[PDB]
Write a protein that binds this ligand. Structure first.
Ligand SMILES: [Zn+2]
Ligand SMILES: [Zn+2]
Length: 72
């Protein structure tokens, strides 16, 4: 049948490529553990070199269901 609904969902760029470093301008794909703030790769190298930076994805795993052990 045709009648009914259809997924084919989609969404423009609203918050996908809008989270960039205000100092560099590079999409922030990391999260500092010292100041618990978002930062770019160029930052973890300079801005936050000492602090313990972790890929945003990693910081999330914590919020969501527990995660398995892995020696990053
Ligand atoms: Zn930066
Ligand atoms: Zn930091």
């Amino acid at each position: 049948g045709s009648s009914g609904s259809s997924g084919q969902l989609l969404e423009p760029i609203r918050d996908f490529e809008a989270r960039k470093c205000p100092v560099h301008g590079k999409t922030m794909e990391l999260f500092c553990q010292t100041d618990q703030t978002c930062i770019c790769y160029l930052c973890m190298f300079q801005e936050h070199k000492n602090h313990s930076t972790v890929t945003v994805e990693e910081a999330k795993a914590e919020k969501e269901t527990e995660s398995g052990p892995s020696s990053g």
